[PDB]
Design a protein around this ligand. Structure first.
Ligand SMILES: CCCCCCCCCCCCCCCCCC(=O)OC[C@H](COP(=O)(O)OCCN)OC(=O)CCCCCCCCCCCCCCCCC
Ligand SMILES: NC(=O)C1=CN([C@@H]2O[C@H](COP(=O)(O)OP(=O)(O)OC[C@H]3O[C@@H](n4cnc5c(N)ncnc54)[C@H](OP(=O)(O)O)[C@@H]3O)[C@@H](O)[C@H]2O)C=CC1
Ligand SMILES: [Zn+2]
Lengths: 342, 209, 87, 115, 96, 145, 129
């Protein structure tokens, strides 16, 4: 170790952790939690960003003076990638959209870019590479999002053979687009569910647990070269999950079955949006997709993280979807969701 | 008084304050332990802590005293004493245009009678002493922290309390609130040794042990 | 194996309680060392210590025998029990 | 010299009566605290914390020290009841952001020089 | 004067320069390393030596009260020049 | 290689040529990953399933008290005795002296400066050795203040 | 005499619970009670009059940005002054700190004679003034 990247201090803000991390896609849901945890212990964080600097301001208080550094980069520009990794010992990729844009499609953000990041990261002598894929990524999935996750996961594994790949379930947290997605369906009256959500099982994982697992994967030598599956403790039917959301929010729950072909057409309609689609055809597939059971892969308990129940953190996410009448209701008021015994 | 740079001495005020000092010691022998006047003419009455209310009431209400205003009430921490805290009352007599100082002592576990019955100014001054020195005042209308943060642990003005304290605050995005963490400094406060090894004031030289 | 490796005798230079141990060392210690040429018998003194006899066998096990207010004869037996019988 | 002015309690039985009285007040107040401050903790968690804070001082035997801890305990109760404290002040008891620090020798040996 | 490393980084007048493997040179990416370019060691050497006709000369730095404290320099050694301990000007005795 | 701490970086006990016990204090902590010397051995012992019965500095000094009580009496010289007994055992073997002259290891000042690892690494002792073997010609430095 | 109506507490004074100090800075800290040694560079002795209490030195490290000396020790600059060793010890006991006391080092009286510098048959004669 160079004399500068030797840990010092007590793991606090002004300590030196020895980690120098380049975090791609640090400006989204998962990125802010990752950068927060790296900055807590005293890491040097390089945050390359495509967006306006105003949209990175919430990251500034996450690290001591000098510790958070910001760079501009373009996902199709290899020289911008190199400037941002050449000094780092770990490179974390959290780049992704849940929808397609005129400029960047699922092939570009989940295959082209992660592999360009992986190729440059190895040529620059980066020791650790961490790639975030998806639990349900498959070459034969009816979600173009998940088929692109599968193709990119293989390219990343070939470009950076020592890459640690983390496959999380659907992540819930204050900015998740998962339990906030369901709680925002109230704006349309009832809740359209395919097969009434009785044929779909989900295993959501808490954001902090995903973040803790990522941080350990950096500091753990064994994690290198492995693929992990980050999943929650319990498995729920989609119907029971969505019913639990509406109970925590104290909203009226009126689920009605909607045929797959129709609910596809609703997705096509919301995609015309030139901003951020409320829903897309792909989001329909992913939500109504049974979360895989991958026993051969290691999980959070291996990295040392205890998965947090959805029943301890749902009020945290869903209290802002209540009305004044129910704001003060407490975590014990609602019935726990029925869990599939697995 | 004709040395341009030397503060002149007011012998008349020294004599008057010395006389009034004996006067207070004659009337209240049960509580008065020491009386002294400084070279710049400030009278001090040192008392047993039981006499706070009797001594302060006599000074406020006696007709040859009439110290109607409590200018200040504070505490000094001296760790080398068994009674480490020195409670100081500074009083003003508008009738006679005089100030007097009354001092007493206590330790961590001993209460001092609240002087709110004599001066209503003392209410906040005692809350401050309780908060910064941890001296309890018995029979206070409401004793609680006044200066430190809610839930703050310790009494910062004790000489053995660290300058930067034990906890610092930051805003943590994960919990979306201000959190308290153990204190770390990017630059440690630099302790300077300044005391000169050569004696400066022979008149105050203490006797050899 | 399981044999004695070392002996330590702790005693005070002047205290009455150690008077027994001092007499032993003056008279009988020389013979003891000549009898056991290779066993290290460490007589370490220090003012105001309750005299003791530490014995160290193989693999770090140790035993302590008080000698407070013993007599030179008793000290001899105490050493004999250690030298002869080895755990 | 052992004669010392009492703060409140004349012996450890009078002091422990005030400890129990203060535990009842804190025990009753936790449900209201979780409600008013809108804490995500459970009422069981809050009562386990109150209990924990009461075990830290379980070894004391000086009536005057016991009285001060009770005086400080009642001061903290008032700040909570009257909502002088804020949510950040209530959640400082739970040290939610402080990462766990190793207790054993080897883990402590690998990180640094602290005993 | 200003030198550069094989990595391209400028070396300051104190000799500081991040070495090849130090990650701390990331703070200059997209920005610049601020090095003052007038090395006082180079500038004080350009000054001519002053020939004086006495054993002892005094320097106050120039400008009177705007210089440094006045000090006296012994010029008996003829194998070297007298140097001001404050400003670095050099003096030599003129073979008297 | 297991890095340790120099005498300026730990609180350690040393016994001088008189048998006086004295303890240093930590001035600065060890550099890099270096650790205290007795902690490395205590850490190694645990890894080897041979854990030692001490985990703090006070406990490793209670152990020193069991082996030799004088090692924890700081600044106190504990006198020894029993010289008569020591001489008696000395005579038994009767070894034979040699005819070599008694030449000390250090004869001139130049052998004094660099004698252990700390002084061998010092560049000041390096200039001291140069000065006493080569004169002031190559050791001089221009000094102005 | 004093008539407050007093109790009798026979326990040792121990104020750790009521001081607000975190746990790790009482159990693990060793205090040093000592009279400071005279600075050898000077002959003044007025800084060797009082007893001092200081705490064991803990890690300082280099700040990544500026290179300043960073610390996580809240007691690094803490020094207390006492008149006697018994005063210093009592303070450490009630605060629960373990301490190692060091007895005062008093310079010994020397026999100085100016006339000895010119002795007739002794070695104390000086060859220069
Ligand atoms: C026949 C049935 C037809 C109805 C079909 C309903 C299909 C389901 C569509 C659900 C869309 C949910 C949704 O609107 O969420 C997206 C967005 C959430 O946004 P927000 O929570 O404010 O913050 C995150 C960044 N926008 O939305 C929002 O910003 C708030 C809600 C917008 C509601 C628009 C009406
Ligand atoms: N439930 C979940 O959230 C789950 C997420 N994942 C994966 O985790 C990773 C993080 O997801 P999350 O961060 O939550 O999604 P976000 O949209 O919250 O953040 C995604 C990041 O991707 C960046 N990004 C997207 N497209 C581009 C582009 N073309 N060029 C550059 N940057 C781009 C965005 O930057 P900007 O803000 O500048 O557009 C944003 O910072 C993704 O790979 C996602 O697939 C996997 C399983 C579950
Ligand atoms: Zn000059």
């Amino acid at each position: 170790l160079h004399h500068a990247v030797i840990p010092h201090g007590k793991g606090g803000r002004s300590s030196v952790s020895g980690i120098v991390a380049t975090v791609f896609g640090a400006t989204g849901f998962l990125g802010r939690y990752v950068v927060n945890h790296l900055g807590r212990m005293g890491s040097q964080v390089i945050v390359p960003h495509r967006c306006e600097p105003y949209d990175t301001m919430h990251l500034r208080p996450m690290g001591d003076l000098g510790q958070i550094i910001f760079m501009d980069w373009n996902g199709r520009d290899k020289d911008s990638i190199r400037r941002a990794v050449e000094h780092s010992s770990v490179v974390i990729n959290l780049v992704g959209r849940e929808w397609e844009t005129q400029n960047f499609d699922f092939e570009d953000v989940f295959v082209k870019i992660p592999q360009a990041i992986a190729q440059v990261s190895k040529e620059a002598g980066v020791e650790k590479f961490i790639h975030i894929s998806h639990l349900n990524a498959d070459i034969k999935s009816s979600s173009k999002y998940l088929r692109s996750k599968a193709v990119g996961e293989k390219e990343v594994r070939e470009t950076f053979p020592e890459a640690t790949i983390i496959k999380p379930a659907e992540i819930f947290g204050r900015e998740d687009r998962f339990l906030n997605y369901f709680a925002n369906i109230r704006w349309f009256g009832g809740v359209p569910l395919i097969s009434l959500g009785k044929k779909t099982v989900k295993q959501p994982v808490y954001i902090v647990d995903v973040t803790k697992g990522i941080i350990n994967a950096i500091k753990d030598p064994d994690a290198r070269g492995k693929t992990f599956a980050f999943v929650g403790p319990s498995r729920y039917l989609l119907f029971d999950l969505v019913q639990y959301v509406f109970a925590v929010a104290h909203r009226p729950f009126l689920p009605y079955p909607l045929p797959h072909f129709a609910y596809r057409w609703i997705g096509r309609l919301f995609e015309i949006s030139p901003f951020e689609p409320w829903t897309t055809r792909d989001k329909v597939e992913r939500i109504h997709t049974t979360d895989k059971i991958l026993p051969h892969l290691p999980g959070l308990e291996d990295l040392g993280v205890e998965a947090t129940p959805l029943e301890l953190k749902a009020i945290e996410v869903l209290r802002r979807h209540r009305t004044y009448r129910w704001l003060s209701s407490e975590i014990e008021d609602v019935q726990p969701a029925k869990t599939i015994p697995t | 008084d004709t040395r341009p740079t030397v503060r002149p001495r007011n012998d008349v005020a020294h004599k008057q304050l010395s006389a009034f000092g004996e006067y207070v010691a004659e009337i209240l022998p049960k509580y008065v332990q020491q009386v002294q006047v400084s070279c710049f003419n400030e009278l001090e009455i040192c008392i047993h802590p039981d006499g706070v209310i009797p001594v302060l009431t006599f000074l406020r209400d006696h007709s040859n005293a009439q110290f109607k205003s409590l200018a200040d009430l504070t505490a000094v921490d001296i760790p080398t004493r068994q009674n480490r805290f020195e409670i100081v009352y500074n009083l003003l007599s508008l009738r006679f245009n005089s100030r007097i100082r009354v001092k007493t002592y206590t330790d961590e576990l001993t209460p001092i009678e609240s002087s709110v019955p004599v001066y209503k100014a003392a209410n906040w001054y005692e809350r401050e002493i309780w908060d910064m020195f941890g001296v309890f005042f018995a029979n206070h209308p409401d004793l609680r922290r006044i200066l430190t943060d809610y839930g703050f642990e310790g009494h910062p003005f004790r000489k053995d309390f660290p300058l930067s304290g034990y906890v610092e605050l930051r805003y943590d995005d994960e919990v979306k609130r201000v959190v308290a963490e153990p204190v770390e400094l990017a630059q440690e406060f630099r302790k300077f040794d300044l005391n000169s090894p050569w004696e400066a004031f022979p008149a105050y030289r203490q006797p050899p042990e | 194996k399981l044999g004695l490796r070392e002996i330590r005798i702790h005693l005070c230079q002047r205290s009455p309680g150690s008077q027994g141990v001092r007499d032993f060392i003056e008279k009988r210690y020389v013979e003891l060392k000549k009898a056991n040429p290779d066993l290290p018998i460490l007589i370490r003194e220090c003012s105001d210590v309750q005299p003791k006899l530490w014995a160290r066998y193989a693999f770090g096990q140790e035993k302590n025998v008080s000698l407070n207010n013993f007599s030179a004869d008793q000290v001899t037996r105490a050493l004999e029990n250690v030298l002869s019988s080895k755990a | 010299s052992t004669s010392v002015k009492p703060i409140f309690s004349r012996d450890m039985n009078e002091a422990k009566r005030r400890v129990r009285e203060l535990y009842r007040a804190w025990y009753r107040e936790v449900p209201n605290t979780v409600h008013l401050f809108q804490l995500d903790i459970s009422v069981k968690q809050g009562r386990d914390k109150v209990r924990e804070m009461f075990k830290k001082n379980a070894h004391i035997t000086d009536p005057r020290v016991v009285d001060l801890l009770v005086i400080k305990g009642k001061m903290e109760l008032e700040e909570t009841i009257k909502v002088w404290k804020q949510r950040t002040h209530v959640m400082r008891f739970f040290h939610e952001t402080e990462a766990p620090r190793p207790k054993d020798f080897l883990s402590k040996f690998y990180v640094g020089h602290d005993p | 004067g200003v030198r550069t490393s094989p990595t391209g980084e400028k070396v300051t007048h104190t000799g500081q320069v991040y070495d090849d493997g130090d990650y701390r040179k990331v703070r200059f990416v997209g920005r610049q390393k601020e090095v003052n370019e007038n090395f006082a060691i180079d500038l004080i050497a350009e000054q001519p030596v002053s020939q004086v006709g006495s054993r002892v000369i005094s320097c106050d730095g120039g400008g009177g009260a705007l210089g440094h404290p006045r000090v006296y320099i012994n010029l008996d050694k003829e194998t070297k020049t007298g140097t001001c301990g404050y400003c670095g000007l050099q003096f030599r005795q003129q073979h008297h | 290689i297991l890095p340790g701490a120099a005498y300026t970086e730990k609180s350690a006990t040393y016994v001088n040529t008189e048998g006086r016990a004295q303890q240093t204090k930590v001035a600065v902590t060890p550099p890099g990953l270096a650790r205290e010397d007795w902690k490395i051995i205590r850490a190694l012992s645990e890894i080897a399933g041979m854990t030692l019965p001490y985990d703090t500095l006070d406990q490793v000094r209670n152990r020193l008290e069991e082996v030799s009580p004088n090692l924890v009496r700081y600044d106190d010289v504990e006198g020894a005795n029993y010289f008569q007994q020591a001489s008696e055992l000395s005579k038994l073997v009767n070894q034979q002296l040699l005819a070599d002259p008694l030449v000390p290891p250090q004869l001139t000042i130049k052998d004094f400066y660099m004698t252990d690892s700390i002084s061998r690494a010092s560049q000041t002792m390096a200039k001291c050795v140069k000065a006493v073997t080569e004169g002031a010609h190559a050791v001089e430095e221009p000094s102005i203040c | 005499t004093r008539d407050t109506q007093l109790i009798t507490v026979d326990e040792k004074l121990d104020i750790t619970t009521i001081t607000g100090v975190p746990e790790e800075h009482i159990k693990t800290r060793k205090a040093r009670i000592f009279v400071p040694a005279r600075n050898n560079m000077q002959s003044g002795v007025n800084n060797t009059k009082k007893w001092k209490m200081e705490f064991d030195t803990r890690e300082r490290w280099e700040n990544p940005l500026m290179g300043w000396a960073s610390t996580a020790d809240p007691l690094s600059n803490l020094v207390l002054t006492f008149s006697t060793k018994e005063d210093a010890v009592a303070f450490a006991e009630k605060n629960g700190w373990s301490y190692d006391v060091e007895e005062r080092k008093v310079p010994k009286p020397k026999s100085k004679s100016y006339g000895a510098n010119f002795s007739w048959n002794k070695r104390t004669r000086v060859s220069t003034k």
